[PDB]
Design a binder for this molecule. Structure first.
Ligand SMILES: CC(=O)N[C@@H]1[C@@H](O)[C@H](O)[C@@H](CO)O[C@H]1O
Ligand SMILES: CC(=O)N[C@@H]1[C@@H](O)[C@H](O)[C@@H](CO)O[C@H]1O
Ligand SMILES: *[C@@H]1O[C@H](CO)[C@@H](O)[C@H](O)[C@H]1NC(C)=O
Ligand SMILES: *[C@@H]1O[C@H](CO)[C@@H](O)[C@H](O)[C@H]1NC(C)=O
Ligand SMILES: [Cl-]
Ligand SMILES: [Cl-]
Ligand SMILES: [Cl-]
Ligand SMILES: [Cl-]
Ligand SMILES: [Cl-]
Ligand SMILES: [Cl-]
Ligand SMILES: [Cl-]
Ligand SMILES: [Cl-]
Ligand SMILES: [Cl-]
Ligand SMILES: [Cl-]
Ligand SMILES: [Cl-]
Ligand SMILES: [Cl-]
Ligand SMILES: [Cl-]
Ligand SMILES: [Cl-]
Ligand SMILES: [Cl-]
Ligand SMILES: [Cl-]
Ligand SMILES: [Cl-]
Ligand SMILES: [Cl-]
Ligand SMILES: [Cl-]
Ligand SMILES: [Cl-]
Ligand SMILES: [Cl-]
Ligand SMILES: [Cl-]
Lengths: 61, 537, 537, 61
């Protein structure tokens, strides 16, 4: 799947996660600032919310 | 050519000629005004750039101050538009000068721009801050600087010598001093310098008004959609060291000295990674690192100073857009996204109030709901859309500005107030958002004049007309043409009459009351309530 | 003659012929319906009048119930107009029947009038309650009774057998029973009986709605400018015995039995002398002796019952005047008299709020002031006049009525709501008072028809039109003509849409919202606030 | 002086107080109900307010 990829300090860019999943890391509570996107499914935390997906393609938007 | 060469106290510069429909302008971009705040200098107030041998290339914007990049909506102009466009660096303290062509003879008035971005983001290089049209059309000198943001600018361990706080504001000041010293080199008149900013930019302006060491650096102030006494604009000392220590612990750190020492060893990106954790939480329109009331830069809280301050001999221009609160709602409030019409249920509304109005008793939200509910139509989604957009709008902007405006006028200043209510035809946010926070700028800077952009004819006029307003204020401390009938007169805002004008494609229209009924809630009554709900614990 | 003779279960009566422009009417005035509540019977529920030998003279109103006489403005119609006109007696339980001429054949609908007067005053004999025009114009039977007021009607030692309380309401009931039994003797139809009252009169009506033993005594209810759930309309048990005991001590008294025994020995006038002492104080629109929530007549508080009650098969007509609060302000609020324009300072305003809104926390008055202040014009005396007239108006009348109206509609009843907004040309109160409490009556009763009074032509029509409205409701439970175009339709009030009509010299106009924003404060929010300010002690 | 005169249970009437003063008894606090008028100057109390006058004539209004 073609997914979004970036960090805290970079623009979003498309990337071939291909085999497997994508993630969308953000601030769990308001303001729900997006903290990053990439390939895989990384742990979250009290402050970090991670939303995982596989199918839709560029789904981690 | 000819006058792209200019010499300032520090050394030689080489500028560049920018093209405008009306004619050329002289730009000098990326002038070093401080010793790069790196290594041991991180968190430290700026030191004046030492003089250089040779000729400095000032044909292009220098790197943007190291900041967080807003990625909410990948590939979306409306957010990406304020994102960093130059590379990202801590070595970022550079400023820019625009000046007419040919360089004026007699000294001309200077406008200084301070960008906003919630004190966590921003850059002088943003396409919407291009000074070329304003300088060409109203022949004045335009200067803007970069100032440190996020932790690099505002992380504070109050009373600390290693991290004093407020250094981002200090960056702004150093540049203002640089202007006294060097603006004549461009035809600029250091005895006529006007400050104008937007949002955090506006809140800064307002703080130079209240910080004596800065009072002799400028003569006029324009605050757009912001103000020092906003609830988001300043943090207390207790709170500030709470946040800095949280950040420290989050980053493995580790005595304030060894704390900051360690902090200074971490990559810049590691610090930005953890910026948003340190927020008290459950809020929209709140930011981790903002100016502190340390007793130094500000001796009391902006509100305290505004009340005592004498303001005779000052002229201020204050204003807001028509829908201040709208776009912030997509950063949390349930049911809000830009990709539909955000028609919320009565139940998403009640939940949003808690978001748009952070840490506030239960009884307090009732009181908000009481005021912002149309009891003839309590469930109307469209009505509840605007309502929460007003709650956020009025709480964070329109009421802090209107308070200020009234306190100034009443205490010596001459104030002029506006409501910007015209939606850019090029606007890329949904229609429900109306005229959102920060969308009067592109007009003020006359960007519609750029022929490679797709603005309408009436709009190109609008910006012209508007630039005139700003220019007339900087020159004279009065926006409306030195002597112009049968043009409607823009009267001064006063504490009683409370007059303002509505800037749109129609001619000037005079209204009374800047959200006068709403603000009486926020300013007069709410604090009497919180005083009581707090002595109920 | 011919039909001035009539016989009722108790005995023979002799009536009198009253003259109207339109034609004659048969009146039977001062019919004894209870054993005079004197000596040992003072404070006791009424006993049915025992039957008499002979023919009772019913050509003239019997004495007014022993009450306080309002003397604020000596020689002033506007106050004197509601003062007792017959002699004053405890022996006062008599009622009156008006009936068409000639006595109808087939049974016709019956209207029963319950007068107001804050539960401390009133009489069926008042010139403004003359039933002659209403009966003549809409051929229906009109009945009104006297009921005990002040202490004689409502002094209660809850749980007492010697002074149970609520006996004034009991007087009303006895008369309603009398009507079931005897109205056919006048062409009246006991299966179609409508209650209509004003103020305390309205609040009574509302209590017969909520007291099961009365539900089978009438079929329709009209409440004008009042309601059982008004803050002045009911008192608690604790409060009530506080007041009765205060009165006792004040009068030298002295076990509830020996307390009431002693109380019963005092002249009536000694009791009225001390009526106004027992009030909790610092208030306008509050009265010493009013109905108690004893668990008997009312099993719960009017509010509690209204919420649970099922109301299917009921039709109610509810309304208010345009300026309910106005005239009460001259009984305390600083700066208010009828003899000027009562243009108050911002400071008399703030002081008045404490008066017009009795015992309520400091934070609560702020909240009122917050709502009723025009922050564009905070000092405008004329504006502060109306504002306090609304505070009192909405708190005591318009919001209790509007709550009720919404709760009924929502729970089975069919409701029709009006705002009476036309000032009598003969009105004798100052102009600032507008259309004051109790000045729609003279029109309802068609008094403008009286040629010896000085009403205008349009007005004589107005009353006619209005009487039709009332008559159509009593007959059908729907005010607007059985089938009448192109006449504007008076729609039913509902909880959501909230439709009402504005009765004035213009045709019916339909408005939405009975002071909907103000009432959301009084009904929704204020109690959430007082809940908190009380758990702050 | 010609002054107003009445009780708790009677209409106001004019009367010749002549030599000396008039009074206007009322409820000290709101509602400031008028409780009587007559000749002289009688004590008040916590609940009773008495306003005295001599000159104006029917001044105890
Ligand atoms: C922040 C927000 O409102 N997001 C919600 C999401 O959590 C929910 O699953 C969906 C339901 O339709 O709508 C969207
Ligand atoms: C109840 C009230 O407002 N009465 C006042 C009176 O006490 C005062 O002496 C006078 C001042 O002009 O105005 C009137
Ligand atoms: C708008 O979109 C957002 C995210 O997809 C969602 O929260 C909300 O339910 C939508 N509103 C609608 C469908 O009315
Ligand atoms: C109106 O008259 C009353 C009593 O005389 C007084 O309280 C008030 O001062 C007067 N209002 C004026 C003079 O504006
Ligand atoms: Cl270019
Ligand atoms: Cl050199
Ligand atoms: Cl870019
Ligand atoms: Cl602090
Ligand atoms: Cl102050
Ligand atoms: Cl906060
Ligand atoms: Cl609600
Ligand atoms: Cl021109
Ligand atoms: Cl000047
Ligand atoms: Cl306006
Ligand atoms: Cl407003
Ligand atoms: Cl007569
Ligand atoms: Cl007989
Ligand atoms: Cl009379
Ligand atoms: Cl109780
Ligand atoms: Cl309920
Ligand atoms: Cl009360
Ligand atoms: Cl105030
Ligand atoms: Cl007809
Ligand atoms: Cl029917
Ligand atoms: Cl309306
Ligand atoms: Cl309203």
């Amino acid at each position: 799947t073609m997914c979004y990829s970036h960090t805290t300090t970079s623009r979003a860019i498309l990337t071939n996660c291909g085999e497997n999943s994508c993630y969308r890391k953000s601030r769990r509570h308001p303001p729900k600032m997006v903290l990053g996107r990439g390939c895989g499914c990384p742990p979250g935390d009290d402050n970090l919310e991670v939303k995982c997906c596989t199918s839709p393609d560029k789904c981690n938007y | 050519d000819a006058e792209l060469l200019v010499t300032v106290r520090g050394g030689r510069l080489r500028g560049i000629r920018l093209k405008t429909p009306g004619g050329p302008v002289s730009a000098f971009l990326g002038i070093p005004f401080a010793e790069p705040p790196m290594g041991p200098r991180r968190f430290l107030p700026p030191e004046p750039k030492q003089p250089w041998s040779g000729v400095v290339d000032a044909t292009t914007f220098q790197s943007v101050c190291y900041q967080y990049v807003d990625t909410l909506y990948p590939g979306f102009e409306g957010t990406e538009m304020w994102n960093p466009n130059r590379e990202l660096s801590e070595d970022c303290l550079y400023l820019n000068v625009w000046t007419p062509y040919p360089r004026p003879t007699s000294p001309t008035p200077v406008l200084v721009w301070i960008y906003g971005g919630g004190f966590y983001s921003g850059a002088s290089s943003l396409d919407v801050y291009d000074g070329r049209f304003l300088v060409q059309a109203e022949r004045t000198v335009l200067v803007s600087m970069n100032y440190r943001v996020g932790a690099f600018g505002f992380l504070a361990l109050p009373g600390s010598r290693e991290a004093p706080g407020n250094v981002g504001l200090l960056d702004q000041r150093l540049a203002l001093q640089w202007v006294q010293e060097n603006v004549a080199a461009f035809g600029g008149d250091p005895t006529s310098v006007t400050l104008f900013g937007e949002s955090a930019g506006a809140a800064s302006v307002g703080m130079h008004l209240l910080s004596p060491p800065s009072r002799g650096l400028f003569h006029r102030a324009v605050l757009q959609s912001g103000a020092p006494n906003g609830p988001w604009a300043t943090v207390g000392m207790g709170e500030a060291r709470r946040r800095a220590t949280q950040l420290a612990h989050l980053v493995g750190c580790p005595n304030d000295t060894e704390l900051v020492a360690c902090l200074r060893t971490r990559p810049a990106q590691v610090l930005v990674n953890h910026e948003w954790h340190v927020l008290p939480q459950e809020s929209v329109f709140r930011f981790s690192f903002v100016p502190v009331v340390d007793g130094d830069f500000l001796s009391d809280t902006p509100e305290a100073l505004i009340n005592a301050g004498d303001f005779h001999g000052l002229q201020v221009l204050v204003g807001v857009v028509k829908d201040e609160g709208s776009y912030f709602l997509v950063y949390g409030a349930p049911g809000f996204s830009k990709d539909n019409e955000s028609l919320i249920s009565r139940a998403e509304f009640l939940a949003g109030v808690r978001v748009g109005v952070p840490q506030v008793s239960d009884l307090a939200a009732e009181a908000v709901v009481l005021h912002y509910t149309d009891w003839l139509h309590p469930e109307d989604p469209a009505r509840l859309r605007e309502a929460l957009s007003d709650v956020v709008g009025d709480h964070n902007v329109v009421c802090p500005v209107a308070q200020l405006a009234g306190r100034l006028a009443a205490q010596g200043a001459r104030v002029y107030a506006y409501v910007f209510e015209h939606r850019a035809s090029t606007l890329s946010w949904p229609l429900w958002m109306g005229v959102p926070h920060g969308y009067e700028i592109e007009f003020i800077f006359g960007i519609p004049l750029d022929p490679s952009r797709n603005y309408t004819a009436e709009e190109k006029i609008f910006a012209q007309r508007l630039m005139r307003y700003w220019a007339n204020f900087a020159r004279t401390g009065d926006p409306n043409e030195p002597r112009d009938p049968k043009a409607p007169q823009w009267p001064p805002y006063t504490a009683g009459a409370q007059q303002y004008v509505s800037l749109d494609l129609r001619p000037l229209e005079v209204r009374r009351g800047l959200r006068a009924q709403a603000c009486a809630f926020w300013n007069r009554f709410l604090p009497k309530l919180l005083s009581a709900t707090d002595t109920l614990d």
